[PDB]
Amino acid sequence: PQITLWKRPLVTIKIGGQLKEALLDTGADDTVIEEMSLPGRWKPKMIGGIGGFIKVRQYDQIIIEIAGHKAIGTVLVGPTPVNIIGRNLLTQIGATLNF
Amino acid sequence: PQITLWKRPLVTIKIGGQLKEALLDTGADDTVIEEMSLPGRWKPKMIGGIGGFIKVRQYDQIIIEIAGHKAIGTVLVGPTPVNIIGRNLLTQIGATLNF
Ligand SMILES: CC(C)CN(C[C@@H](O)[C@H](Cc1ccccc1)NC(=O)O[C@H]1CCO[C@H]2OCC[C@H]21)S(=O)(=O)c1ccc(B(O)O)cc1
Numbered sequence: 094p095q096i097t098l099w100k101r102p103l104v105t106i107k108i109g110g111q112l113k114e115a116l117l118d119t120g121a122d123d124t125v126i127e128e129m130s131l132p133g134r135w136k137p138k139m140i141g142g143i144g145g146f147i148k149v150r151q152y153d154q155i156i157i158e159i160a161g162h163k164a165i166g167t168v169l170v171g172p173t174p175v176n177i178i179g180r181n182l183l184t185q186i187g188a189t190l191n192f
Numbered sequence: 193p194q195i196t197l198w199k200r201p202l203v204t205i206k207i208g209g210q211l212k213e214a215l216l217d218t219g220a221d222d223t224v225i226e227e228m229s230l231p232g233r234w235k236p237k238m239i240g241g242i243g244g245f246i247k248v249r250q251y252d253q254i255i256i257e258i259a260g261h262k263a264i265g266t267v268l269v270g271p272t273p274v275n276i277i278g279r280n281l282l283t284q285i286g287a288t289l290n291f
Pocket residue numbers: 118119120121122123124125140141142143174175177179215217218219220221222223224239240241242243273274276278
């Protein structure tokens with residue numbers, strides 16, 4: 094698909110057996126999802142942006158489906174105001190910015 | 193160009209005659225730049241990011257070049273961690289996300 098940027102580029106994802114809405118975010122290095130449980134090991138991390146830092150749980154080797162495209166990678170879970178698909182997963186679905 | 197996302201999508205911008213680095217950010221509604229001098233009046237705005245809200249100064253109808261493409265629009269100035277080009281100006285340069 095070609096997604097214009099007149100509005101937020103929101104898509105449906107499937108993660109941990111749940112459907113969620115998430116933002117395709119070229120400005121995010123990593124993928125950050127609101128509180129949920131995921132299987133396997135995790136380690137704490139701090140991530141920062143406008144307004145400062147939040148503490149998240151880092152889960153590695155998590156399978157997501159992003160607008161129908163499967164990809165595996167690290168997912169950060171914590172008190173993000175929006176679910177964000179960051180570059181670590183955007184690369185895996187072949188997403189590019191074009192102009 | 194077609195910009196892949198293995199690296200941050202950093203570009204050069206020109207604003208007020210000065211070159212700066214900025215991040216092409218599809219997750220940002222608005223364009224936010226670090227402290228600098230801009231002409232004219234400003235209006236208040238609160239924006240919310242990952243770690244909470246920050247106050248910024250809103251300057252309208254500012255001339256800005258993004259990766260060589262001319263835009264004229266709203267620039268927010270404040271304590272952002274990096275300069276971010278948001279959708280208000282990504283749309284002016286004709287940017288889309290593609291996969
Ligand atoms: C500021 C940016 C450099 C980074 N962010 C990504 C932005 O796209 C961010 C996403 C977002 C959207 C909505 C609420 C919270 C976070 N966008 C953002 O902060 O947008 C602000 C500023 C611009 O205009 C508004 O548009 C949306 C909310 C406002 S970030 O969300 O702060 C972020 C994501 C991942 C990581 B990491 O993996 O170490 C670190 C930081």
